[PDB]
Design a protein around this ligand. Structure first.
Ligand SMILES: [Cu+2]
Ligand SMILES: [Cu+2]
Ligand SMILES: [Cu+2]
Ligand SMILES: [Cu+2]
Ligand SMILES: [Zn+2]
Ligand SMILES: [Zn+2]
Ligand SMILES: [Zn+2]
Ligand SMILES: [Zn+2]
Ligand SMILES: [Zn+2]
Ligand SMILES: [Zn+2]
Ligand SMILES: [Zn+2]
Ligand SMILES: [Zn+2]
Ligand SMILES: [Zn+2]
Ligand SMILES: [Zn+2]
Lengths: 152, 152, 152, 152
């Protein structure tokens, strides 16, 4: 079943949705994301970050696209991509995204290099603009505008 | 000799000093930093960022402490220190600073993994408060307040 | 309406955009500046000069930051500032700028001492680096690199 | 007694003579100027500038015909004349000039609004061309080709 429930908040502190995760067969992780209050009909950057910490308004604090394999950013970079690089969100007329994405190169298993429930935890962040799938170190996705932490 | 001159600007895009660089002997790089308009008497964090970009007001734009070898932040971190972690700057009653720091784990020579003059460039950033040499991603140094871009 | 169209050239005489001006409510002058071929990512200084003449290559040729009340240079100078001093321009990764700056101490009205549309005209200039908002004659902005003449 | 000795250099850094100054009787200042390496037979622009600073090649850097009384440039302009406006140099077959000029509207006195030995200092500059005694801001004299600074 889906578990590991994570509340999403915006820069102003508003609850705007949740994520749940499932230990996918197979393999990697299925991510149920169900959010509101987004730019209606935008393409938006979406990634797993390396530190479970969402301090507003900016969320720099903390990190880092999740990158246990030390690669460059981008599905279409020949030197890419990071393990927490996911495909863009496609927001409805509503301002909602309600989908399930696969994250092949992640895990919940302690010990494993692909673990996102490590000591640090990890963060899911929505960006202001699209990931261009190519530029270092975050696809030119702009400001981090929603955040949720999974605690480690 | 020192060269590769970088201008420093604050969050208002005012000129606040400069930086020059020497291919050290020995080793890494020597970084001459001569800055004004700063908090009088402050210790302020100081690091090389992974992209040669300085967009006001808050400089997230862009990146990233420069991290070729994928470690954590901090001189006092066992898992640590990013190749762009430099020691804290000490500001006089003056508002000013004028030192030469050594950055041993950097290079200017094209194609070295430690190369800070890559296609991307690098940025020198001064923070609003002192680094603790330990916490991820930036040592709780706070806001980015001065940025100078090394381009190409 | 914005009117009084001015073409901008570089040190080579190449066209690099334009300028338009609105009698601002309120008040003073609104200044629409749209430019290209500039150093990507740079803060560049930007000032209204006192004569409407742009002779290649260095634009000396004339003058003069526009200084009808005979002050010193600098937003940050207690003995400032010239009527022609404006805030620095920020250039995109693009090499471009496209902004409206407000110039509160200028006028288009014949006879007003703050008149930029006088019998010898005024020039709009971009410099090679950022104004410190302090030093005389021009805030250590470096060479004049782009000029357009407003000829009243 | 002449004193306050200043070394004259050209745009290329060659020593090309000197100026000395006497607290005139009366009034203002007598200026002994003795220069070489100049265009033989030319009538040339010669002025006291408001900042003691001679940066080569161009001497823009710094300022300003010296102007404590907020006047326009030119003996023959009726809105006329800068305190540092002087008569044109008349170069001999030599390429040499060796004269004493009177500057009636200046002074060495530290309490004086006419003081040229102020905090800032003044520059004496020779122009590439003749001053037309009429036009703003420097009488159509062209490039600044020789500069000597009096420090403040
Ligand atoms: Cu991202
Ligand atoms: Cu930092
Ligand atoms: Cu200027
Ligand atoms: Cu002159
Ligand atoms: Zn990434
Ligand atoms: Zn982690
Ligand atoms: Zn670091
Ligand atoms: Zn120094
Ligand atoms: Zn880089
Ligand atoms: Zn100015
Ligand atoms: Zn525009
Ligand atoms: Zn004018
Ligand atoms: Zn004059
Ligand atoms: Zn002075």
């Amino acid at each position: 079943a889906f578990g590991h429930h994570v509340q999403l908040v915006n820069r102003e502190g508003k609850a705007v949705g949740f994520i749940e995760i499932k230990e996918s067969d197979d393999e990697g992780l299925d991510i149920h994301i169900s959010a509101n209050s987004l730019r209606p009909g935008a393409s938006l950057g979406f990634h797993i970050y390396e530190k479970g910490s969402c301090v507003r308004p900016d969320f720099e604090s903390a990190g880092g696209h999740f990158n246990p394999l030390n690669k460059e950013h981008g599905f279409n970079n020949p030197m890419g991509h990071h393990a927490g690089d996911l495909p863009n969100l496609e927001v409805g007329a509503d301002g909602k995204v309600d989908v399930i994405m696969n994250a092949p190169d992640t895990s919940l298993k302690k010990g494993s290099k692909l673990n996102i429930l490590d000591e640090d935890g990890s963060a899911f962040i929505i960006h202001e603009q699209a990931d261009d799938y190519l530029t270092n170190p975050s696809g030119n996705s702009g400001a981090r505008i929603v955040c949720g932490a999974l605690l480690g």
